[PDB]
Design goal:
Blueprint lengths: L15 E7 L8 E4 L9 E4 L10 E5 L12 E5 L12 E3 L6 E3 L7 H4 L2 E5 L8 E7 L6 E10 L5 E6 L5 E6 L9
Antiparallel strand pairs: 1-4, 1-12, 2-3, 3-11, 4-5, 6-7, 8-9, 9-10, 9-12, 10-11
PDB class: serine protease inhibitor
Keywords: serine protease inhibitor
Assembly: monomeric
Length: 183
């Protein structure tokens, strides 16, 4: 019981690709990457500030051999099309002066460092909206008492980072179909 559900009432597939969109349309678009600081390529995960964009398709993978993902299960999140310079497509939380930050890595990482997320359903809602928790899984064990929220930087980048109660909410929109063109 209690599996993750997508924007269309359907169960989220394990290993499937989704667009991670905001609950409130007006808050931006989907998830993508940016090149920041001394970075050799786009390794910081940020929310697109443009509402039309669905961002990059994201693979949601859990620790179990199950077709679907139950709430309470730790997940690894990774871009279906990672920046070539990232060792693996998986997101990870790296410390820094400003606080813990979500991002890709240049070196292929261990499972305990990528299986660090967990979705928590939003209370007051007609559809399935979730908050993203970061689970302290480093000092041998795991406690999810931190959230992933946004932090706008100097260049205007809405970077995903751990915060003190400024949780972002997500709606998981299944990926696979469409796009357009000009003339």
């Amino acid at each position: 019981d209690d599996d993750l559900v997508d924007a269309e009432g359907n169960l989220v597939e394990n290993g499937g690709t989704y667009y991670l969109l905001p609950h409130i349309w007006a808050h931006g678009g989907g998830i993508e990457t940016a090149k920041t600081g001394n970075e050799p390529c786009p390794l910081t995960v940020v929310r697109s500030p443009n509402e039309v964009s669905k961002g990059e398709p994201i693979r949601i993978s859990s620790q179990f051999l199950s077709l679907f993902i139950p709430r309470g299960s730790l997940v690894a999140l990774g871009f279906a099309n990672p920046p070539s310079c990232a060792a693996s497509p998986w997101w990870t939380v790296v410390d820094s002066p400003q606080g813990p930050a979500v991002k890709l890595s240049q070196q292929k990482l261990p499972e305990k460092d990528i299986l660090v997320f967990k979705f928590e359903k939003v209370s007051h809602s007609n559809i399935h909206v979730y908050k993203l928790l970061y689970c302290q899984h480093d000092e041998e064990d795991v406690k999810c008492d931190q959230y992933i929220g946004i932090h706008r930087d100097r260049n205007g980048n809405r970077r995903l980072v751990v915060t003190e109660e400024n949780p972002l909410e997500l709606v998981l929109l299944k990926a696979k179909s469409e796009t357009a063109s000009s003339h």
